[model samples]
Target: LENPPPPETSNPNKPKRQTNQLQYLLRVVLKTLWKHQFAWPFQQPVDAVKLNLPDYYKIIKTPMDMGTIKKRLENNYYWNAQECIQDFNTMFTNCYIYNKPGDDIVLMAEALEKLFLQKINELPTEE
Candidate 1:
C-alpha cells in the first residue's frame, strides 16, 4: 500500500544515474562460482597505495630510486578514521544511482565508480 503525501513546494533536481557494463560483469564473476575464493592465496591489504610520483605520470622508464620508492610506500597514508570518513561520506551521498535486482551486488559497484568520478555538487550521505 502507498500513501500520497503533501507535495513539497520546492523540489531539487532529479538524481544522477550512470553505469559501466564491464565492471558490472567482472564483479559478478569474481564474487560468484568462478571465484568463490582465490585459487592462489592472496590478501588485499588496505595499506594505502603510494608512488614516488603522482599517478598521472607514466612509469615509462625503470624507477630511478627503488630505495626512495620503498620509503614512500612505507610512509603512505593508509586509510585511518579521517580517510574512511571522507570516503564513506562521499559514497553515502550518491546511493540513488543503483537499483536492487536479482544480481544487484555487482551492479552497485559499477554505478558507485561512475558517481564517485562525476564529482557532482550533491554528496552521498549516511542519512
Candidate 2:
C-alpha cells in the first residue's frame, strides 16, 4: 500500500517565498534611510586618509556604511533582516564610538539611528 506524505511537507517553497518578501521589505527600509537628511556621513565608508583620521581604522575594525549595505543587498549577501539591521547598527555605532558626543556627525548618526528604528518598526509583522 502507498502512503501519503504529511501535510507539513506540502509547501517546500514557502520559506523561500517568505525570504523574498522580507528582502523586499528590507530594501524599502534601506531606501528610506538613504533619503533621510542626516544620511550623508553614513552614506559611504569613512575616508580615513582623506579625512586625516588615521586612527579610524584602528578604532573601528568592522566599519560599515549605507553604501556597503546597499551593495550587500544587491549581491544578496544578507540572509535575513537581522543581518542587515546589524550592519546599520554597526555604521551608527562606529560614528558614536569614533566621534565626541557633541559632535555634528554624532548628532546626525543619532538622528538617523532613530529614523532607522522607526522605519523597521513600521514594517508589517509576519502572520
Candidate 3:
C-alpha cells in the first residue's frame, strides 16, 4: 500500500482523476484556513486528495500552527522542531508554561476543527 501507479493527467481524452469527495473537501477547507494563516495538521504540505485514514497520525503528532510550521518547512529537512515548550530556552519563551503543552496544542487544534465544521456548513452545495 505504499506506492501506486502514477496519476493520469488533464489531456481531455483520458479518464478524469477520481478522488474521495470528503478528502477533496477537507483539503479545500484546510487550504482555506492555510491561506488565512492557520497551521495545517501535517508535517509537510499534503495533497488533500492523496491522503488516507492512516495518514492522519502525521497531522496529529506535532503543533499545527502555520506561522511555526511554514518557517520550519525547509529546515525540517535536517532537524526536528518543537512548537509549544522549551526547558532550556531563554525567559518568556513558552506559549503554555503553566499548562501542559500537549493539552494546549490539542485544545487550539480542536477549536480550529470546530471552525472548519462551521465553515463547511456555510459552503454552497456542489452539483
Candidate 4:
C-alpha cells in the first residue's frame, strides 16, 4: 500500500497538476496539526482494550485519527479539502462525546480543534 502508483489521471478534463497542488496544501495543514502539543492523543487510533474503554467503539462508530487521515491523504481518498476537514471534525467530535466536559483530553481536543479551524481558514479560497 505504501508503494502504490501515483494518482490515476482518468479524467482528462480535470488538471492533475492542480489536484496535486491542493494535496500538497492539505499535507502542510496535517503536518502542522501533527506537531501540535495537544495532538498526542489524536495522533493514532484509540486502543479500546488497553485503555480500558471497551465502549469506545460502540460510541464512536466512525473513529478518526491523524494517522488514518494521513494514509487516506497519501492514497488520494479525499477529493477536496472539505473531505479532509470533515475527518478532523469527526476526530474531535468523538473525543467530545467519549470524554467528560472537564477532562484533560477534552480540553486538548478543544484546543486542537481551534487550531485546525484557524489553519483551515488560512487556506486560499476557490476563485
TM-score of each: 0.17, 0.78, 0.32, 0.79
Candidate 3 lDDT score at position 78 = 11
lDDT agreement with native, every candidate: 0.27, 0.72, 0.35, 0.74
What's model 1's overall lDDT? 0.27
By lDDT, the best candidate is 4
Name the regions of candidate 1 deviating beyond 4 angstroms: 1-102, 120-127
lDDT of 1 by residue, 35-82 (tens): 323211111211113322232123111111112212222333221323
After superposition, which runs of candidate 2 have C-alpha atoms over 4 Å from their true positions?
A: 1-21, 24-26
Q: What is the lDDT of candidate 3?
A: 0.35
Residue 29's C-alpha lDDT in candidate 3?
48
Per-residue lDDT of candidate 4, residues 90-110 (tens digit): 999989898889799999999
Report how far off residue 83 is in candidate 1 (Å).
Answer: 0.8
Tell me the deviation in Å of residue 55 in model 2: 1.3
Model 3 lDDT per residue over 7-98, tens place = 22123443332223333333454455555433444323323346643443333232223333333332221121111112112111222342
Worst 10 residues of 4 by lDDT: 1-10
Worst 10-residue lDDT window, candidate 2: 1-10
* Clash count list over all predictions: 6, 0, 2, 0
lDDT of 2 by residue, 1-127 (tens): 1222211212334333346435654567788888988887777778766677767777677788888787766655655777778888988898889889979999898888888888787766544
Ranking by TM-score: 4, 2, 3, 1
lDDT accuracy of residue 68 in candidate 2: 76
